[PDB]
Amino acid sequence: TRPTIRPRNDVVHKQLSAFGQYVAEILPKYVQQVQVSCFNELEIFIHPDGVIPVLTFLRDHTNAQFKSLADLTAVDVPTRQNRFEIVYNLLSLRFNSRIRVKTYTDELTPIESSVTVYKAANWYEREIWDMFGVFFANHPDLRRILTDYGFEGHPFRKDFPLSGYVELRYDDEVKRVVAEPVELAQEFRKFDLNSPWEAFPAYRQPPE
Amino acid sequence: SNLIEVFVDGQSVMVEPGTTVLQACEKVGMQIPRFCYHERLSVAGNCRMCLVEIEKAPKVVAACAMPVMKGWNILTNSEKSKKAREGVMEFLLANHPLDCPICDQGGECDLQDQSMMFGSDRSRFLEGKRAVEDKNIGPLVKTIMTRCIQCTRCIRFASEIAGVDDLGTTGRGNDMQVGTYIEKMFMSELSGNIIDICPVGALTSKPYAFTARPWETRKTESIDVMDAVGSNIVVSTRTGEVMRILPRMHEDINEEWISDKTRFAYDGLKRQRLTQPMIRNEKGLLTYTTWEDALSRVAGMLQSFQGNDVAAIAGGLVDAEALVALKDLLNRVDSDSLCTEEVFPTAGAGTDLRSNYLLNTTIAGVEEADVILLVGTNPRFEAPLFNARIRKSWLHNDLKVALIGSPVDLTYRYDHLGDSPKILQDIASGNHPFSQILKEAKKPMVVLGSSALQRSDGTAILAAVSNIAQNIRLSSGVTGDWKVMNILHRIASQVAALDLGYKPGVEAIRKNPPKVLFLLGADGGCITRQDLPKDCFIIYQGHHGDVGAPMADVILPGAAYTEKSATYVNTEGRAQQTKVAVTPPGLAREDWKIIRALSEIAGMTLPYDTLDQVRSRLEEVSPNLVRYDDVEGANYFQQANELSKLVNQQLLADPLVPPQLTIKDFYMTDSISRASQTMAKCVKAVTEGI
Amino acid sequence: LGLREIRIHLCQRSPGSQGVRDFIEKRYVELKKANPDLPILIRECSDVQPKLWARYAFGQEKNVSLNNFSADQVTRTLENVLSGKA
Amino acid sequence: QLIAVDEKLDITTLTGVPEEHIKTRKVRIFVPARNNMQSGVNNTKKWKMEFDTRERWENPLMGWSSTADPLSNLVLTFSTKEDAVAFAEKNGWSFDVEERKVPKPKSKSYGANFSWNKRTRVSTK
Amino acid sequence: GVRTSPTGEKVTHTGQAYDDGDYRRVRFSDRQKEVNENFAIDLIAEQPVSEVGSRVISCDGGGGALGHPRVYINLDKETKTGTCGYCGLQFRQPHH
Amino acid sequence: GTSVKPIFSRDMNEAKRRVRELYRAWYREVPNTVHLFQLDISVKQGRDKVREMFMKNAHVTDPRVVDLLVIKGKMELEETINVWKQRTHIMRFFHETEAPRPTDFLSKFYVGHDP
Amino acid sequence: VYDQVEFDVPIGSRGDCYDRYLCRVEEMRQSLRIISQCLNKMPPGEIKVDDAKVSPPKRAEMKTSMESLIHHFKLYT
Amino acid sequence: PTTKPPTARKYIWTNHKFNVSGTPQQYVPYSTTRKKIQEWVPPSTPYK
Amino acid sequence: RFRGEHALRRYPSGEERCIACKLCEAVCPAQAITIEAEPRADGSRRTTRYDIDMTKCIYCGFCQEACPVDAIVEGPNFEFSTETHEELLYNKEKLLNNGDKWEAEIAANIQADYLYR
Numbered sequence A: 001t002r003p004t005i006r007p008r009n010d011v012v013h014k015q016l017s018a019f020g021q022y023v024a025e026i027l028p029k030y031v032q033q034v035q036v037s038c039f040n041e042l043e044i045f046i047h048p049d050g051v052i053p054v055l056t057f058l059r060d061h062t063n064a065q066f067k068s069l070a071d072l073t074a075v076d077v078p079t080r081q082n083r084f085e086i087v088y089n090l091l092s093l094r095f096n097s098r099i100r101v102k103t104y105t106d107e108l109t110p111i112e113s114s115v116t117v118y119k120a121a122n123w124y125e126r127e128i129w130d131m132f133g134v135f136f137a138n139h140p141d142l143r144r145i146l147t148d149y150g151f152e153g154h155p156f157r158k159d160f161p162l163s164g165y166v167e168l169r170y171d172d173e174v175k176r177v178v179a180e181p182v183e184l185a186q187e188f189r190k191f192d193l194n195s196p197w198e199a200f201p202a203y204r205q206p207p208e
Numbered sequence B: 001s002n003l004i005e006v007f008v009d010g011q012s013v014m015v016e017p018g019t020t021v022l023q024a025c026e027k028v029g030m031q032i033p034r035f036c037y038h039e040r041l042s043v044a045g046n047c048r049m050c051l052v053e054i055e056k057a058p059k060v061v062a063a064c065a066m067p068v069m070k071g072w073n074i075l076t077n078s079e080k081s082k083k084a085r086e087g088v089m090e091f092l093l094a095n096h097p098l099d100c101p102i103c104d105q106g107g108e109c110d111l112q113d114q115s116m117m118f119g120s121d122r123s124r125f126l127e128g129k130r131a132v133e134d135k136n137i138g139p140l141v142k143t144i145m146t147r148c149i150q151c152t153r154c155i156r157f158a159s160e161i162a163g164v165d166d167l168g169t170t171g172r173g174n175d176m177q178v179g180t181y182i183e184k185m186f187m188s189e190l191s192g193n194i195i196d197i198c199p200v201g202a203l204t205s206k207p208y209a210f211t212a213r214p215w216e217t218r219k220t221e222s223i224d225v226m227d228a229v230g231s232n233i234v235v236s237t238r239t240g241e242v243m244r245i246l247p248r249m250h251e252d253i254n255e256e257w258i259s260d261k262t263r264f265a266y267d268g269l270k271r272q273r274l275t276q277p278m279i280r281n282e283k284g285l286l287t288y289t290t291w292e293d294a295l296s297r298v299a300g301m302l303q304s305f306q307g308n309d310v311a312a313i314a315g316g317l318v319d320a321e322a323l324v325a326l327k328d329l330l331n332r333v334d335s336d337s338l339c340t341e342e343v344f345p346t347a348g349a350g351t352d353l354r355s356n357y358l359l360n361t362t363i364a365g366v367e368e369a370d371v372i373l374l375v376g377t378n379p380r381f382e383a384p385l386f387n388a389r390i391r392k393s394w395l396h397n398d399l400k401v402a403l404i405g406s407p408v409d410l411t412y413r414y415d416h417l418g419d420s421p422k423i424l425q426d427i428a429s430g431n432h433p434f435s436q437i438l439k440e441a442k443k444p445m446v447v448l449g450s451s452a453l454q455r456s457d458g459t460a461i462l463a464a465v466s467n468i469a470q471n472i473r474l475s476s477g478v479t480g481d482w483k484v485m486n487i488l489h490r491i492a493s494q495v496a497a498l499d500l501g502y503k504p505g506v507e508a509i510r511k512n513p514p515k516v517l518f519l520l521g522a523d524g525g526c527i528t529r530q531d532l533p534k535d536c537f538i539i540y541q542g543h544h545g546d547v548g549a550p551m552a553d554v555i556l557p558g559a560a561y562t563e564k565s566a567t568y569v570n571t572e573g574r575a576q577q578t579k580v581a582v583t584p585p586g587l588a589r590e591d592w593k594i595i596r597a598l599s600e601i602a603g604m605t606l607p608y609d610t611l612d613q614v615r616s617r618l619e620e621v622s623p624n625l626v627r628y629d630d631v632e633g634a635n636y637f638q639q640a641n642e643l644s645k646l647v648n649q650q651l652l653a654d655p656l657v658p659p660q661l662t663i664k665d666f667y668m669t670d671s672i673s674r675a676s677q678t679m680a681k682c683v684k685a686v687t688e689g690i
Numbered sequence C: 001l002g003l004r005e006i007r008i009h010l011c012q013r014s015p016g017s018q019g020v021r022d023f024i025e026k027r028y029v030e031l032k033k034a035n036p037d038l039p040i041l042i043r044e045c046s047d048v049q050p051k052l053w054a055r056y057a058f059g060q061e062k063n064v065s066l067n068n069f070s071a072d073q074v075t076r077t078l079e080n081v082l083s084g085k086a
Numbered sequence D: 001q002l003i004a005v006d007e008k009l010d011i012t013t014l015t016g017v018p019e020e021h022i023k024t025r026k027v028r029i030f031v032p033a034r035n036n037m038q039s040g041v042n043n044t045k046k047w048k049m050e051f052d053t054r055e056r057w058e059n060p061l062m063g064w065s066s067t068a069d070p071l072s073n074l075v076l077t078f079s080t081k082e083d084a085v086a087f088a089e090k091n092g093w094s095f096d097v098e099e100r101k102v103p104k105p106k107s108k109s110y111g112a113n114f115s116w117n118k119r120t121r122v123s124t125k
Numbered sequence E: 001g002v003r004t005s006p007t008g009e010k011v012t013h014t015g016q017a018y019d020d021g022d023y024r025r026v027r028f029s030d031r032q033k034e035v036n037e038n039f040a041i042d043l044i045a046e047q048p049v050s051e052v053g054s055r056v057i058s059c060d061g062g063g064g065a066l067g068h069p070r071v072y073i074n075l076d077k078e079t080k081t082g083t084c085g086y087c088g089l090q091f092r093q094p095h096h
Numbered sequence F: 001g002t003s004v005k006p007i008f009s010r011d012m013n014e015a016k017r018r019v020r021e022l023y024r025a026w027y028r029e030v031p032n033t034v035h036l037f038q039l040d041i042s043v044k045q046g047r048d049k050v051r052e053m054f055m056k057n058a059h060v061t062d063p064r065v066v067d068l069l070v071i072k073g074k075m076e077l078e079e080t081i082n083v084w085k086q087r088t089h090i091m092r093f094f095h096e097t098e099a100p101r102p103t104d105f106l107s108k109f110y111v112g113h114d115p
Numbered sequence G: 001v002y003d004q005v006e007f008d009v010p011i012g013s014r015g016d017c018y019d020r021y022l023c024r025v026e027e028m029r030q031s032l033r034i035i036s037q038c039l040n041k042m043p044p045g046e047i048k049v050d051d052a053k054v055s056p057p058k059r060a061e062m063k064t065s066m067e068s069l070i071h072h073f074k075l076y077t
Numbered sequence H: 001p002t003t004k005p006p007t008a009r010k011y012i013w014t015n016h017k018f019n020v021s022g023t024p025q026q027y028v029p030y031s032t033t034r035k036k037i038q039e040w041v042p043p044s045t046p047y048k
Numbered sequence I: 001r002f003r004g005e006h007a008l009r010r011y012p013s014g015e016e017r018c019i020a021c022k023l024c025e026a027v028c029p030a031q032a033i034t035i036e037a038e039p040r041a042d043g044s045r046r047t048t049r050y051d052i053d054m055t056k057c058i059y060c061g062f063c064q065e066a067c068p069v070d071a072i073v074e075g076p077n078f079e080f081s082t083e084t085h086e087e088l089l090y091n092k093e094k095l096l097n098n099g100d101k102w103e104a105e106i107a108a109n110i111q112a113d114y115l116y117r
Ligand code: SF4
Pocket: B096, B097, B098, B099, B100, B103, B104, B105, B106, B107, B109, B110, B111, B112, B147, B199, B200, B201, B202, G070
């Protein structure tokens, strides 16, 4: 491992693995998986019903005190029965550590709002609802935050087209801005960049 | 059973004896690097890129050529195999030219990709590189031999697949060069495939040069309509324009190859195109007009005449949707004269029994036959991929081939029995010793071409072939569902038309001349204005201006096969659909939509309004047209053979002479080919060569 | 009233088409002997009921079902269609 | 706490897609064919969903390629054919599914290149 | 080497010119049509053929790292001259 | 089988009741929207547009979808009442600038290739 | 290289706008301090990772070596 | 450019021009490619 | 190193440097380059269309660093404001004219900076 390769830290790896097993032992009702990545990032995969308990634990336990919510977001994977995965990034200042909590939902299953655990979640949840269509139960005021008023659809979904469905212009007959079906003078050029000849043998999937 | 156990990176797998290390690694999901190895070519072992380590063996082995042994543990990602790959790539790149920005294989190069995946990222070659002179092998394959890496894929393909021994290596050592050693054009119906098999930019497509990059193109998986094989293809498009045609893999039809016509005749889609409706002006000249006017003029005559006064002829590139739409439109006026240009004898069963006009053995079944008899056909130019399958079976299965007809060159040695149709009678009687040859066979095959059916002896020829097949089945017994009898077709629209109830041939027009005539892409010229009464109303619907358009009163511009989702049935009886690659130019429309709009304007509205409803109608008329990869069917040979013995038409004293006598007759066969400038270049090159 | 063509859509393996298949392999030839100018198209269904289609003048069509019919029954149905009797 | 409803899933009214881009389109579900120019097979592993091709015309200024259908560049990736069918069905798109094409196993023998009496003997190597 | 259309428009080095029936010509009224006067094909056609006493020559376009990738050109064929695939310069062996 | 977590309604009747409440609220609001935005439409056609937008989703037989639709409609009503929308957003429901599209087979044949 | 430079972190006491303004001014001063240290300890060597499968080769290498041209082509396409 | 002048090329503009926007000399964009699809030309003689 | 108005360059013989590899078109983050190519009358690999939409361009300079033959460059000129949107859609003739206009300064700048590239 000469100067072009990123150095690795075994002590942090061991510490994060130990804390992951600790968390899993404490909350076996909700934890389904624990992982530590090769660049020393710990993630915990939980059942959706445990969003409020688990987070509360990680915020209030003396051995965790993850008091900061760094980020809350969603990822859309159409091939899964539960389309959306919800990712919470937490920072602990007492122990100078970071953790990630993942759960899942589909287009019709509500997720509990975590504003009672972290005040920062409020706008984040709004953003998720705006961009993916995930509903959060018991949210103080859930509504659109990024899209235009009356905008239809959720643009961060994979099946949503890049340029959308409508475009805006000014019309002098009705003397106002109007929305019309989108027409592009130059269509966006789709590129097929992926090569054959797989790059990484370590991630090869079984040929099933 | 007899399977042996081997290990790939410690994972157990059972393989058949004689399996190579490369195939065992394939069974696990690992693709070994390769340059010279190809699945459909013979093993070479030159490039040494497949070298891999076997556990507890000091020397690496060539995975493409070495059979695996019981207990072997193949280490695909071991340090020794990685270093072997790096060294081989270093040697390959030492003399390679820095041509990537000007090389047409830039974004789709196996050399580039395997260098990025398995080689080093830098060079330590401090010498000058070798440069060789380019060779000229015709107007289709552009040659830049400094990019050659000497994998000998083209030589093996030319010798084994194409049956042409023109390519070789001259010289020795570092200056050993691939070529012909003399000024010689490599001309064959399958010559363009060496572009695809060549891993580098040494061999490229000349008409495609410098037009696109592989990352810009959009891929449409579709069907070729240049013959009746139905080879699967990929149309490459960019910004609404067709750029090139590539083969799409289908193990049962064309494996991995296409014909030179299929590959290069797309040039003709850009010339002599029909773009707007046209009508005759007061001077008598064709002038542009709207869809409303042309459709109203056609509908007025469709309303004025009925019964046997209305007729239609279907050309060679017509889809099943348009065929059934025109048939319904003419039935609504009480007309039954729905004809095709290609003649099939209607005596006996005719088109009532499907197996009477199909390649019942199927294309793949040729690999199971041990004897084949060709009657009055040139499969080399009528059905190049069928002939390639015959060549493959001849090479690998020791297939015996005999031919009735002119002694054409088929790229393999066959037994010429003669030129006279009466020879069939002798074989049908048992005097000829080839009757004894066919009697001893376990899987005999008799193939009769439609070109021998067009010669007005078609009834007698078909009866003689059926008699031979019946004698085979009666003497050798029923081996199984082997389906000896076969009919090899030439045009892509014939089987669908016969399935839908079109009368084969144009004799019904001659018997009862019509006063309104529909030409659905008909460009064979078998009907002239002389064979029709004065002031006959002729409508031409199609996509090209050819012999069919200038004789018409109204021109309705249709869509080509790259511009619609359409159903075609190949010579086996297998239905396949194309997809829309681009849209029709100008005011041209989908053909079934044209017929439906005409029916609505004429007061005879057809029940269907969408493509799905047209396919439902197709299912109602012939339900095999909506099963899109199925080839299996019933065998009614006994009924057809019993019905073929009623009429006793005599044979002519006229030798069977196929229309495609030599390669110069292969390039121009349809309106798209005749508009192709590349086909014109090919004809010029083969007629006079430089 | 003028018959133009008839269509028989039978399936290869399903038992419901069994009798229909029998009819063909037993009697179709004789039928084609009596009607040398009538197109009797034989086509293949798949997981569908057996059917008989009859086309008359000006494109009118009538279809009847042949599910579980025997050879005698399909012969009677075909004679009824050919004669025109209800 | 559980409705226990029994009905096919349909989220068409919630996705904001215009009406004529639901019941008029035809999606294709398929494993893409290998590019014949290359030998690598890594692009023939997953299932793709892609929409039907619509009209492309020439821009009167500058001659660019113009389109009016918003789904011309939309391609979705799926692990199995069943996942793609489920997605298309719940999204209200009519689909055509093509079965995966797999290269059949081949018998390869280097020794057959030099045959005593078969036709497989090669004239050059 | 610019030419002129039968209408009066200048023909570009790509051969572009609106035909007589084209309405798009209207964009040039009261204005001009931008045409580059130096045609690269004619300019590269005027370069003299270089003479080298070797079977293989190398070309990088001049200027070293300021040129193009270095390529090697074979000069065994006496019928024609070797042409660089980037630069267009020509080379030949001293025939006679 | 197929037990699922509710959003708001245990069955179809509760969803219908929520739909009726939302419709009542929109019907009450329409005249205020017409007056306050200084629109050029009448109250009658505003209420007709509300009814049409409700009838567009009348085929839904799933309570979760129904009350998600109700949540979205309540969001839209809250946007309208608080005058967070402009006149352009309100007028977008009527498409007064979009050219009429023929549903006839012949007209679509004449205009282009689009089915 | 942050762990190789020394600086102080300004900390407020009342959590209002005035303390945040003071903190921002102090961070400007500490940035000057860090910039001085960075100027004095700038080391020699290359400026991108010597791994041509990630970082593009030099133009001269691209125009002289086959692997460099291939890696440039692939990295930029 | 007095002490060291630019390299002389025969394709370099001998007369510099300023910004000619809002002037009959302004640049007007246009397509530089040829027509893609060629139409069929009817014969000049009648059929009957 | 300043990035300004784009230009197309040529060799000292007057032959254009561009050989239509489409690397600049592939790398353009804004999809502002449109290229069409074909063999020339002398068999040379050249472009028939080279368009840059200057109202889509972000002036990042990725195209000039992707170019293998120094064909497309970002020049030193920045005073090219326009009274219409149309004149900011550059075709090949405009870019060749810009190269012929600015080659002296472009060559001097490239000579000054190429040892860092
Ligand atoms: S063959 Fe491949 S590696 Fe060689 S110049 Fe062409 S694209 Fe580059």
